[PDB]
Write a sequence for this structure.
RNA sequence: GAAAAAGUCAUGGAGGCCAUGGGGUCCGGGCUUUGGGGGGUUCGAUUCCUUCCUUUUUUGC
């Protein structure tokens, strides 16, 4: 067990994470209460040890600084003086003793700092007072748009509709792409591309900046984003260490954008700078069938960096949620906006807002988009600072929203626009992209298996 | 290795043409400095007009093919070793160009090095109808490559680990004439796309493993001063079918090995290198071609209004 | 993707601070130029060993 951020700080790749433990060090009761409500990896029965280690590290650092000051002073004195002089011999002996003490105290301090940082990086972020407490069951409802479409017959599943239209293939795909795979064909791919282009244009029309991030990122970006690349119960893919070392797959475009903005200032006049990026995302994830839970899936994520004020960050998150609601209303999908609890917020999240669409074929609502606001978790981890008009650097805020997810959107559209005959209608916004008012049966003949 | 056609002309400028990287860095559309730890070496970060250019080049050819009749199909990105070996790729060796997944976490999982393998796996052990032929399917996906040429042009976008490619696969009948005509159609389609974009290119026939014929299209690059391959259409007569047991049901009903044809529609790295080095201006501007004007929205690219991102890291002179 | 060389205004020596060639300001003269980052030997390491990064040489798909 180790931490990539500490390794980078040790090797000099980046500065040491400037944690805000002191923010709550003055009132351990509030921090313990928040940790208990979040119920993260770290419990409330281990904070005192972390504080004790931090205090000991501070004292050792102070003693080391004092010793370094004395050594520098004696070295300067020797330099200004410049063998048999008793003063020279005394200074040499004092320097030897100081060096011995420094080498004796250095490993102790290094081990203490390593332990303290490895125990402190596991702490979660703050929580908004308006965020309800409890499990997923305690999800507050904020807005409900649309209604459940009325069906004159039993609605069929999304997988069944896709197999009938020959647009989504999932049978006998083990030897092709492992489990939880699919092959979008025809109208399925056309609908996916239309949705992606529509979302991209709608986002570019409101001032957003398009971007493109890689898919193979190092574990450092994930650790700074608040993830666990190397872990037994992890779900993030990892390339072969023999072929490449310290390389991981991009779980989401947000990680790529954070890596891009890592160690880079932003102009105050340019802030808030928002960037939308559409790319594929892979997740091990190790329902039993369908496109609900898949490994690889296309997605467009919006990352915004605003000023330091919480009012500005809140307004940015509100704007993102409003844009997502307008996109869903434009596409014609019945959904509900929920407020995630403290136990499901996450490590870096502070105020998460999820969106659940109505899936008649599934029989219940399903999450199809999420948005979160992190005040300083990412900035303090990746050292994402920003300068002001004067010239001082301050940690900026970061908000990450999911513009659209093709798997859940396709599931919702196929289960909502279905018909009695078997066709699926198209919304009034993607008709231009699809070139068809409705999706009829396919003209080509499906493939027949002739293998073992 | 013999050239067959040559369309277009080399641009003319009153100054020494600059490189694509220099223009991108000046306009701040791409970034490649200080990314060894973020996304490894050789990793670009497109922004501003760069992303709009990529989307334009990934939605122009796709739409053009969709208007001529094409069956779009989205393929996966995590293929198995069987599909890779069936195509003719051997990731078992150490100096391979296919990213291998950790065997401890997964078993026999390999990253998709290109969309060709993904489109080939769709027909693995599946008989296609006779009337459906010819079956053409375009697929735009991200392709990763483990090995790059570091010695030659290391600081550049020519050879990058990950890119966004758009391939065009085609399944034809058992007759070689049909496969040849389909390859000719694909070549003419890509040539028309290149001409519409306004890029000077040259098509050539490579000499002489599993592919029977390979047509390579190399675009002009004033900044580099030498042509560069931008596409390569290969024609495998029966290697893919013989390795993957791909067949088709004829009229009589007997199973036969079907001919496969694959061709690259467009590569974003090379297309943007050609566009940046060809449409160069005196003040670093970049004129948008007459086809991507509707997508980019700007008749002439200019310097960005926002301030570029500085560096506040330890690796800097203080 | 691998192996090798250099290292910050340039050349050359110098672990206790430089010679020459340089850049800018002021009256040929004068002022003035601390070396890319993180680790070890040392009383003090821009100089001895190692690592990150920038540049350069060989091999290869
Ligand atoms: N294993 C998965 N398979 C398919 N789709 C998924 C999977 N996990 C999440 N999604 C989809 O992607 C959306 C993104 O929400 S999220 O993963 O929990 N949050 C993020 O990705 C952060 N980068 C902020 O957006 C989900 O709402 C859901 O629609
Ligand atoms: N390392 C690379 N980095 C970026 N782009 C590449 C790279 N290698 C090939 N390409 C792009 O892909 C095109 C086809 O070359 S190829 O990858 O070797 N051949 C194929 O992909 C086959 N599927 C032919 O359809 C090239 O012309 C170039 O545009």
């Amino acid at each position: 067990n180790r931490n990539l951020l500490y390794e980078y700080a040790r090797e000099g790749y980046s500065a040491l994470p400037q944690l805000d433990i002191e923010r709550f060090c003055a009132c351990p009761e509030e921090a313990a209460h928040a940790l208990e409500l979040r119920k993260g990896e770290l419990r409330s029965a281990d904070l005192p040890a972390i504080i004790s280690t931090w205090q000991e590290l501070r004292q050792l650092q102070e003693q080391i600084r004092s010793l370094e000051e004395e050594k520098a002073a004696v070295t300067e004195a020797v330099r200004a003086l410049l063998q048999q002089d008793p003063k020279y011999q005394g200074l040499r002996a004092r320097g030897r003793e100081i060096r011995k003490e420094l080498v004796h105290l250095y490993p102790r301090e290094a081990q203490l700092e390593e332990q303290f940082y490895l125990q402190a990086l596991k702490l979660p972020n703050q929580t908004h007072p308006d965020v309800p407490v409890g499990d997923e069951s305690q999800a507050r409802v904020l807005h409900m748009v649309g209604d459940k479409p009325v069906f004159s017959f039993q609605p069929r599943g999304h997988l069944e509709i896709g197999e009938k239209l020959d647009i989504i293939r999932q049978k006998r795909l083990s030897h092709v792409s492992g489990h939880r795979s699919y092959y979008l064909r025809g109208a399925g791919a056309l609908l996916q591309h239309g949705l992606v282009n529509f979302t991209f244009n709608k986002l570019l029309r409101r001032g957003f900046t398009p971007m493109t991030v890689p898919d193979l990122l190092r574990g450092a970006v994930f650790e700074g984003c608040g993830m666990t690349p190397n872990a037994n119960p992890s779900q993030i893919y990892n390339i072969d260490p023999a072929r490449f070392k310290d390389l991981n797959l991009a779980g989401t475009a947000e990680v790529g954008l954070a890596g891009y903005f890592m160690d880079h200032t932003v102009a105050f006049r340019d802030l808030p700078v928002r960037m939308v990026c559409s790319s594929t995302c892979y997740r091990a994830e190790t329902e039993p069938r369908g496109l609900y839970r898949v490994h690889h899936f296309t997605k467009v994520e919006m990352f915004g960096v605003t000023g330091p004020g919480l009012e500005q960050s809140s307004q940015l998150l509100e704007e993102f949620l409003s844009l997502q609601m307008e996109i869903l209303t434009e596409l014609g999908l019945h959904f509900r906006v929920l407020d995630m609890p403290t136990q499901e917020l996450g490590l870096p999240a502070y105020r998460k807002f999820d969106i659940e669409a109505w899936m008649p074929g599934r029989g219940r609502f399903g999450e199809v988009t999420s948005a979160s606001n992190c005040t300083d978790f990412q900035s303090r981890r990746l050292h994402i600072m920003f300068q002001t008009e004067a010239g001082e650097l301050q940690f900026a805020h970061t908000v990450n929203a999911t513009a659209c997810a093709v798997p859940r959107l396709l599931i919702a559209l196929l289960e909502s626009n279905q018909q009695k005959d078997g066709s699926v209608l198209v919304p009034p916004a993607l008709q231009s992209y699809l070139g068809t008012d409705r999706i009829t049966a396919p003209t080509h003949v499906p493939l027949q298996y002739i293998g073992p | 290795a013999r050239v067959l056609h040559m369309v277009g002309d080399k641009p003319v400028f009153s100054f020494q043409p600059r490189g694509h990287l220099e223009i991108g860095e000046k306009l701040d559309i791409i970034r490649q400095k200080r990314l060894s730890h973020v996304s490894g070496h050789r990793s670009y970060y497109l922004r501003g007009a760069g992303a709009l250019l990529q989307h334009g080049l990934v939605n122009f050819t796709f739409n053009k093919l969709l208007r001529r009749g094409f069956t779009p199909m989205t393929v996966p990105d995590l293929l198995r070793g069987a599909v890779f070996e069936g195509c003719g790729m051997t990731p078992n060796a150490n100096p391979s160009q296919i990213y291998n997944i950790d065997p401890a976490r997964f078993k026999d999982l390999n990253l998709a090095g290109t969309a060709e393998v993904g489109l080939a796996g769709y027909f693995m052990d599946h008989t296609v109808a006779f009337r459906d032929l010819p079956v053409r399917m375009v697929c735009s996906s991200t392709c990763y490559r483990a090995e790059t040429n570091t010695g030659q042009e290391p600081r550049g976008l020519y050879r990058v680990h990950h890119f966004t490619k758009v391939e065009m696969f085609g399944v034809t009948g058992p007759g070689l004439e049909q496969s040849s005509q389909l390859l000719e159609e694909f070549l003419s389609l890509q040539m028309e796309i290149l001409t519409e974009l306004g890029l000077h290119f040259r098509v050539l026939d490579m000499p002489t493993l599993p592919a029977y014929r390979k047509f390579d299209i190399e675009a002009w690059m004033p900044g580099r001063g030498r042509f560069g391959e931008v596409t390569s259409a290969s024609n495998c007569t029966d290697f893919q079918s013989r390795r993957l047991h791909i067949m088709f049901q004829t009229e009589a009903g007997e199973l036969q090995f079907a001919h496969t044809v694959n061709a690259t529609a467009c590569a974003v790295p090379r297309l943007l290198i050609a566009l940046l080095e060809s449409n160069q201006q005196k003040d670093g501007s970049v004129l948008v071609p007459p086809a991507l004007q509707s997508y980019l929205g700007t008749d002439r690219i200019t310097a960005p209004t926002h301030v570029p991102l500085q560096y506040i890291g330890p690796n800097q002179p203080r």
About this structure: The radius of gyration of chain A is 28 Å. Chain A touches chain B through 81 residues (CB under 8 Å). The first helix of chain A runs from residue 4 to 11. The CA atoms of residues 213 and 260 of chain A lie 8 Å apart.
